[PDB]
Structure formats: structure tokens, C-alpha cells
């Protein structure tokens, strides 16, 4: 409900897809949530390692650099 149908549609179009299915919405929300969960889990690991209270953008970068080819080539 939070991430809207217009947004999901727009994201799909950005990638060339003209027409999506009804379940595509719920699936894109699921996929987004799981991806975010993964990045977060890694970043939080990173920032608890160094004994800090706030999750730095750098922690998110270290975390993203471990999510397959997501930020491939950055650095």
C-alpha cells in the first residue's frame, strides 16, 4: 500500500516494460523490501562492528558493494 501502483508502473516503464500483471505490484513491493532488508542487514553489521550508534552512508556503501553487481564499478 505504501509504494504505489503509479510508481511501480513508472519503474517498469523506466526499464522498457510497457505492461505489467496484477501480481507484479505486490511482487515489486516484496522484492524491494527483501533487497532493502539485505542492504540494511549488512550495513547494520558493519556499523555494530565499529561500535557506533548511527548507520553511516559508508556502511550502506560497504553493504551495497556486497549485493552482487548492484554498484558494480563504483570505486
Amino acid at each position: 500500500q505504501g509504494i504505489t501502483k503509479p510508481a511501480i508502473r513508472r519503474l517498469a516503464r523506466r526499464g522498457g516494460v510497457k505492461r505489467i500483471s496484477g501480481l507484479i505490484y505486490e511482487e515489486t513491493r516484496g522484492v524491494l523490501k527483501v533487497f532493502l532488508e539485505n542492504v540494511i542487514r549488512d550495513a547494520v553489521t558493519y556499523t555494530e562492528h565499529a561500535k557506533r550508534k548511527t548507520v553511516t552512508a559508508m556502511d550502506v556503501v560497504y553493504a551495497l558493494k556486497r549485493q552482487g553487481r548492484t554498484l558494480y564499478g563504483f570505486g
Binding site: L11, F35, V55, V60
Partner: protein, 93 residues
Amino acid sequence: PGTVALREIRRYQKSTELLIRKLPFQRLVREIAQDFKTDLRFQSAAIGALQEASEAYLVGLFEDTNLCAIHAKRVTIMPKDIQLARRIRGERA
């Protein structure tokens, strides 16, 4: 363009171009941080990085699905198509 490096302006512009509304994204990260029983906080830059990367990832997924869709008559994209595209081009994350 005197006291600011053009690179930074490219960056802020790109931030302007995001496709998910920023408030509900914020609330999403919030939700996941609740489910993780996180005692921690996030600096605003981190949320930004999350959103840029997330939209990047989703658009990528859809691009892959588009690239694997070859049909005589145009088709509506369904879950199975995403699955197969992900098998052929690989999981991006």
C-alpha cells in the same frame, strides 16, 4: 558554477529524478528497521543511497525482464517472465 563543482550539481539533479516518493520510502526503511528491532539510527545520506540503489535495482530487474521478452505479439509482463529473465541474465544482487 563558481563556488560549486558541476559534479555535485549532476548529483543533486539525479536526486530530483527519483521515481519513488521520498516519504513512503522513508517509511519503508522505517518498517524494516522496526522488523529488525534496530536500536540504531540512520544518517540522511544513508537513506538517500538506499533509495538511489533500490530504484536502480528495480529498474534493472525490469530491464532484464524486457531484454528476455521476445514475442511475435506484445505481451504483458507476469511473474514467471521475471523469474526466467533472472535465470538467463542472473540475479543482479
